[PDB]
Design an enzyme around this catalytic site. Structure first.
Site, PDB file in Angstrom:
ATOM      1  N   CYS B  14       0.821  -1.208   0.000  1.00  0.00           N
ATOM      2  CA  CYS B  14       0.000   0.000   0.000  1.00  0.00           C
ATOM      3  C   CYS B  14       0.863   1.269   0.000  1.00  0.00           C
ATOM      4  O   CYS B  14       0.321   2.378   0.075  1.00  0.00           O
ATOM      5  CB  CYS B  14      -0.940   0.004   1.217  1.00  0.00           C
ATOM      6  SG  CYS B  14      -0.147   0.518   2.771  1.00  0.00           S
ATOM      7  N   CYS B  17       4.622   1.371   4.075  1.00  0.00           N
ATOM      8  CA  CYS B  17       5.954   1.130   4.620  1.00  0.00           C
ATOM      9  C   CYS B  17       6.912   2.225   4.145  1.00  0.00           C
ATOM     10  O   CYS B  17       7.678   2.781   4.941  1.00  0.00           O
ATOM     11  CB  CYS B  17       6.447  -0.284   4.246  1.00  0.00           C
ATOM     12  SG  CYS B  17       5.510  -1.610   5.065  1.00  0.00           S
ATOM     13  N   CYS B 122       3.059  -7.292   5.467  1.00  0.00           N
ATOM     14  CA  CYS B 122       2.702  -7.948   4.196  1.00  0.00           C
ATOM     15  C   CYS B 122       3.845  -8.805   3.671  1.00  0.00           C
ATOM     16  O   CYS B 122       3.683 -10.022   3.429  1.00  0.00           O
ATOM     17  CB  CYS B 122       2.360  -6.939   3.106  1.00  0.00           C
ATOM     18  SG  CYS B 122       0.849  -6.024   3.411  1.00  0.00           S
ATOM     19  N   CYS B 160       2.523  -2.650  10.496  1.00  0.00           N
ATOM     20  CA  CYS B 160       1.631  -2.257   9.423  1.00  0.00           C
ATOM     21  C   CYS B 160       1.158  -0.817   9.667  1.00  0.00           C
ATOM     22  O   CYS B 160       0.034  -0.574  10.153  1.00  0.00           O
ATOM     23  CB  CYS B 160       0.450  -3.228   9.324  1.00  0.00           C
ATOM     24  SG  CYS B 160      -0.541  -3.087   7.808  1.00  0.00           S
ATOM     25  N   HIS B 204       2.124  -5.260  26.418  1.00  0.00           N
ATOM     26  CA  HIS B 204       1.395  -5.273  27.688  1.00  0.00           C
ATOM     27  C   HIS B 204       2.336  -5.204  28.906  1.00  0.00           C
ATOM     28  O   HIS B 204       2.143  -4.376  29.805  1.00  0.00           O
ATOM     29  CB  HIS B 204       0.471  -6.498  27.680  1.00  0.00           C
ATOM     30  CG  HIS B 204      -0.313  -6.703  28.932  1.00  0.00           C
ATOM     31  ND1 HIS B 204      -1.440  -5.968  29.253  1.00  0.00           N
ATOM     32  CD2 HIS B 204      -0.150  -7.604  29.930  1.00  0.00           C
ATOM     33  CE1 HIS B 204      -1.928  -6.406  30.405  1.00  0.00           C
ATOM     34  NE2 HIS B 204      -1.162  -7.397  30.834  1.00  0.00           N
ATOM     35  N   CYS B 207       3.482  -1.710  29.305  1.00  0.00           N
ATOM     36  CA  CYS B 207       2.464  -0.694  29.055  1.00  0.00           C
ATOM     37  C   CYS B 207       2.253   0.212  30.266  1.00  0.00           C
ATOM     38  O   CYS B 207       2.170  -0.273  31.398  1.00  0.00           O
ATOM     39  CB  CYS B 207       1.147  -1.355  28.666  1.00  0.00           C
ATOM     40  SG  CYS B 207      -0.160  -0.185  28.272  1.00  0.00           S
ATOM     41  N   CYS B 227      -7.429   0.911  31.564  1.00  0.00           N
ATOM     42  CA  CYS B 227      -6.807   0.025  30.594  1.00  0.00           C
ATOM     43  C   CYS B 227      -7.757  -0.215  29.402  1.00  0.00           C
ATOM     44  O   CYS B 227      -8.990  -0.205  29.561  1.00  0.00           O
ATOM     45  CB  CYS B 227      -6.427  -1.280  31.312  1.00  0.00           C
ATOM     46  SG  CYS B 227      -6.175  -2.711  30.262  1.00  0.00           S
ATOM     47  N   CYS B 233      -7.871  -4.265  23.030  1.00  0.00           N
ATOM     48  CA  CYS B 233      -6.408  -4.153  22.994  1.00  0.00           C
ATOM     49  C   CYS B 233      -5.704  -5.507  22.875  1.00  0.00           C
ATOM     50  O   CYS B 233      -5.951  -6.416  23.697  1.00  0.00           O
ATOM     51  CB  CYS B 233      -5.903  -3.415  24.237  1.00  0.00           C
ATOM     52  SG  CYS B 233      -4.146  -2.981  24.117  1.00  0.00           S
ATOM     53  N   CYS B 242       6.759  -0.279  20.944  1.00  0.00           N
ATOM     54  CA  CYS B 242       5.895   0.899  20.835  1.00  0.00           C
ATOM     55  C   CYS B 242       5.648   1.627  22.144  1.00  0.00           C
ATOM     56  O   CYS B 242       5.584   2.861  22.152  1.00  0.00           O
ATOM     57  CB  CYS B 242       4.556   0.511  20.216  1.00  0.00           C
ATOM     58  SG  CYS B 242       4.735  -0.263  18.605  1.00  0.00           S
ATOM     59  N   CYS B 254      -0.714   3.892  19.592  1.00  0.00           N
ATOM     60  CA  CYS B 254      -2.025   3.244  19.418  1.00  0.00           C
ATOM     61  C   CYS B 254      -2.770   3.017  20.720  1.00  0.00           C
ATOM     62  O   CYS B 254      -3.978   3.232  20.790  1.00  0.00           O
ATOM     63  CB  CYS B 254      -1.853   1.905  18.717  1.00  0.00           C
ATOM     64  SG  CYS B 254      -0.892   2.078  17.190  1.00  0.00           S
ATOM     65  N   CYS B 260      -4.096  -1.295  20.739  1.00  0.00           N
ATOM     66  CA  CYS B 260      -3.136  -2.023  19.893  1.00  0.00           C
ATOM     67  C   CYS B 260      -3.922  -3.069  19.102  1.00  0.00           C
ATOM     68  O   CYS B 260      -4.786  -3.756  19.668  1.00  0.00           O
ATOM     69  CB  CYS B 260      -2.044  -2.681  20.764  1.00  0.00           C
ATOM     70  SG  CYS B 260      -0.875  -3.731  19.832  1.00  0.00           S
ATOM     71  N   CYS B 263      -0.287  -5.261  15.069  1.00  0.00           N
ATOM     72  CA  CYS B 263       0.061  -5.135  13.651  1.00  0.00           C
ATOM     73  C   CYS B 263       1.414  -5.743  13.260  1.00  0.00           C
ATOM     74  O   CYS B 263       1.631  -6.014  12.086  1.00  0.00           O
ATOM     75  CB  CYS B 263      -0.019  -3.666  13.182  1.00  0.00           C
ATOM     76  SG  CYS B 263       1.437  -2.630  13.654  1.00  0.00           S
TER      77      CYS B 263
END
Ligand code: SF4
Ligand code: SF4
Ligand code: SF4
Ligand code: FCO
Ligand SMILES: [Ca+2]
Ligand SMILES: [Ca+2]
Ligand SMILES: [Ca+2]
Ligand SMILES: [Cl-]
Ligand code: NI
Ligand SMILES: [S]
Lengths: 489, 279
Positions: B14, B17, B122, B160, B204, B207, B227, B233, B242, B254, B260, B263
């Site tokens: 798409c 990336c 992908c 992604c 997690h 987090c 949460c 999530c 992340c 996210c 989340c 991805c």
């Protein structure tokens, strides 16, 4: 004495595009546009929780995912029977509007400009056409040529950072970008805080300054060198727009209004008259005559005799229509930026107040870039206003439940043109999902009646005085800012 | 200051990336292009087109044989003899036209590469194009390599899209290794070929909402405190950094914003769906 030119990949568009032209007596006399990659999102979507669609559809395209997200969440809002709050509507507009600025900037500089600006002598700026008809070739005064080229190249380089800042703006309330998390059925997932509105605004002012002080002046200067490019790349002169950025909670009013302009006449947009043909597309339809998107079918068939593209062929009242900033700006006919009003006078001797004052010049290679630059400014004016309207703390999300059976359609304009997503739900799952996207309207093949798609038609008459350096073919194509991932999905 | 040669090819992608890479900071993309890599072929941004673009790609793959990175964005569709992804057209010593499929392109370039780096879920794992309902026989690079019996060093950088830090970091680590392998060993990969540098942490476990999770304080809706587990999530089953790194130069991520959706994982999206139903 006809010569065929085939260009695959046609680079500096999104996705997989082939262009074929026939040239005779120094002009294009025929053309074919082909999208060569298929994923089948409409098939993949079937049987899923309808809420997943607003994440799945974003992966149609990493350049315009917020457009697909917007259309999807609007389709879901419609199907689920939920009304978005004022603050939810505004927050959605801020998320999406920040990517309008990103997308137009990315397009003009990082996709279009290397057909005019001579980059440094390192990959990926070279190799390039030997006779590329660039600023450094056109402007005969060598110092002026160098200075103008350097001016354009420095803006290309600066725009890399400006577009990145636009994505900071998208992430502010959207979570991340590409592929936001912040828009869902029922509204938006994060209520804007005063601090985060101020942080968005600070970045926005930097983007807006670049748009007014750098981008608009460059486009008008570029057009003043390439005046011949306002006189070709014409096409059908039929345009369609669905309405984008609703300015009230009942979606009655938009920044850029819906409308159709066909054969010199304005009419209202009636979604009932949209249908898709597949006579030259790699798809099977259960019935002849083109299909309205509400009964659309996605049955891929790469062996279909006579077909040449994975893009379907949308028509409005059986007319090819193009989409994008030219379409929206023509339909709305807004007042031109102060920069545009001034530079049209100073550089061209043109008195123009409103977009349509460009007349014939609008429907051309340079007209499409002008429309896009002007729309970037117009969108920035809107974002500046929305930043005053947004209310810190005000609820952006309304709860909903997946319905057993329903349908919904989300209408918007992607940066590249008219976009709708149609959603049909049965047993709380996606029964059918049909996407009618922007580049779909531009880069489509012939319909069953042999009518060329808009890019195909706009190529007719484009000058190719040098068959080995057919620069105007790519210039025409790129003026439409094609996205083939969107076109095919 | 020798730059890493890169040929960047797109299959069923798409361009997200690529766009995410354009968002890099420290270094930013200008310095990446002028100082870090030589981006020799990239269909979204390169100057040349058609015959000239492909001829240049193949010339680089020859001149830099065993000495370029093949970057792959998007999946590889194998149904209908590869015809769901045509990447270009080539012309013989005679004047005739031949389309090139994504299968043909990867089979050609991978053995010529120094290493292949599959950027995004992908190319790494199949992702959305390979999800339930697809009819294109969409395949990851690792599966295509296995089917083709291609042995070429392969590193996966999923997501992604992936964060630019993951793509830049992995590519720089690979290039450093090539230049001095004993000073710079290759990053340790997990069982799914992705670097532990970026994909070793569980979201997690790391987090900032974990205290709320532990006290059963769950957000009733997206715009309530707590949460995000009840909102869908997938942090519990997802491995990426992340929570530390965040997104778009630290602006948001996210989980703060929403949920989340897992991805980066090899079972994205089907194993992470529905997105808005709890794990
Ligand atoms: S991994 Fe995601 S962002 Fe990258 S090409 Fe695939 S769908 Fe696009
Ligand atoms: S479920 Fe999600 S929000 Fe809750 S602690 Fe785990 S990763 Fe964080
Ligand atoms: S938080 Fe989850 S969905 Fe977001 S980028 Fe990280 S792994 Fe992907
Ligand atoms: N803008 C954009 Fe993408 C396209 N064409 C969509 O929809
Ligand atoms: Ca064929
Ligand atoms: Ca469609
Ligand atoms: Ca083999
Ligand atoms: Cl970032
Ligand atoms: Ni797009
Ligand atoms: S977008």
């Amino acid at each position: 004495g006809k010569v065929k030119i085939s260009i695959d990949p046609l680079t500096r568009v999104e996705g997989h595009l082939k262009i074929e032209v026939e040239v005779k007596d120094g002009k294009v006399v025929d053309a074919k546009c082909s999208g060569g990659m298929f994923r089948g999102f409409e098939q993949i979507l079937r049987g899923r929780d309808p809420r997943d669609s607003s994440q799945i559809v974003q992966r149609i395209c990493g350049v315009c995912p917020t457009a697909h997200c917007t259309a999807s969440v609007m389709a879901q809002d419609d199907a689920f029977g939920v009304k978005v709050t004022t603050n939810g509507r505004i927050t959605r507009n801020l998320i999406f509007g920040a990517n309008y600025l990103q997308s137009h900037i990315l397009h003009f500089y990082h996709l279009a400009a290397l057909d005019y600006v001579k980059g440094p002598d390192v990959s990926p700026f070279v190799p390039r056409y030997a006779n590329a008809d660039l600023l450094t070739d056109r402007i005969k005064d060598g110092a002026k040529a160098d200075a103008t080229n350097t001016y354009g190249l420095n803006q290309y380089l600066k725009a890399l950072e400006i577009r990145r800042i636009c994505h900071e703006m998208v992430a502010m309330f959207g979570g991340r970008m590409p592929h936001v998390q912040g828009m869902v059925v029922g509204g938006a997932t994060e209520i804007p805080t005063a601090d985060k509105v101020a942080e968005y605004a600070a970045r926005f002012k930097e983007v807006q300054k670049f748009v007014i002080e750098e981008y608009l002046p460059l486009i008008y200067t570029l057009g003043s060198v390439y005046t011949d490019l306002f006189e070709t790349g014409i096409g059908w002169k039929n345009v369609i727009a669905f309405g984008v950025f609703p300015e009230d909670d009942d979606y009655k009013t938009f920044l850029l209004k819906p409308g159709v302009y066909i054969d010199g006449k304005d009419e209202e947009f009636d979604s009932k008259l949209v249908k898709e043909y597949v006579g030259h597309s790699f798809f099977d339809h259960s019935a002849p005559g083109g299909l309205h998107y509400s009964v659309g079918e996605t049955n891929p068939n790469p062996d279909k005799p006579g077909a040449y593209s994975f893009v379907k062929a949308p028509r409005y009242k059986d007319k090819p229509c193009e989409v994008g900033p030219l379409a929206r700006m023509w339909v709305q006919n807004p007042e031109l930026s102060p920069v545009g009003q001034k530079l049209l006078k100073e550089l061209y001797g043109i008195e123009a107040k409103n977009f349509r004052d460009l007349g014939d010049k609008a429907f051309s290679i340079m007209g499409r870039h002008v429309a896009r630059a002007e729309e970037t400014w117009l969108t920035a004016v809107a974002v500046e206003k929305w930043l005053k309207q947004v209310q810190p703390g005000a609820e952006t999300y309304v709860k909903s439940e997946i319905p057993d059976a329903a349908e919904g359609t989300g209408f918007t304009e992607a940066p590249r043109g008219a976009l709708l997503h149609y959603l049909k739900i049965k047993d709380k799952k996606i029964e059918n999902y049909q996407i009618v996207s922007a580049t779909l309207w531009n880069a489509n093949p012939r319909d069953d009646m042999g009518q060329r798609g808009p890019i195909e038609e706009a190529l007719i008459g484009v000058p190719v005085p040098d068959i080995k350096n057919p620069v105007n073919v790519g210039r025409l194509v790129r003026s439409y800012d094609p996205x083939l991932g969107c076109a095919v999905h | 200051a020798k730059k890493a040669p890169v040929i960047w090819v797109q299959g069923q992608g798409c361009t997200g990336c690529s766009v995410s890479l354009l968002n890099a900071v420290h270094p930013r993309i200008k310095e990446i292009l002028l100082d870090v890599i030589s981006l020799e072929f990239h269909p979204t941004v390169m100057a040349s087109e058609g015959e000239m673009a492909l001829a240049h790609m193949y010339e680089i793959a020859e001149k830099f044989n065993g000495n370029f990175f093949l970057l792959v964005e998007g999946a590889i569709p194998t149904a209908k003899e590869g015809r769901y992804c045509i990447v270009g057209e080539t012309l013989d010593a005679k004047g005739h036209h031949h389309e090139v499929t994504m299968m043909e392109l990867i089979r050609d370039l991978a053995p010529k590469s120094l290493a292949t780096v599959a950027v995004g879920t992908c190319s790494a794992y199949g992702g959305i194009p390979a999800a339930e309902g697809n009819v294109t026989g969409s395949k990851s690079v690792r599966d295509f390599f296995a089917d083709e019996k291609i042995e070429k060093l392969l590193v996966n950088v999923p997501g992604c899209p992936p964060h630019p830090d993951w793509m830049v970091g992995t590519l720089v680590a690979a290039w450093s290794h090539v230049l001095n392998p004993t000073e710079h060993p290759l990053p340790e990969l997990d069982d799914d070929g992705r670097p532990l540098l970026f994909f070793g942490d569980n979201i997690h476990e790391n987090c900032p909402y974990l205290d709320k999770y532990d006290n059963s304080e769950f957000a009733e809706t997206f715009t309530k405190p707590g949460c995000k587990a009840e909102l869908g999530c997938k942090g519990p089953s997802t491995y990426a950094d992340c929570a530390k790194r965040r997104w778009n130069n630290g602006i948001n991520w996210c989980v703060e914003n929403a949920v989340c959706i897992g991805c980066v994982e090899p079972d994205f999206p089907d194993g992470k769906s529905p997105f808005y139903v709890a794990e």
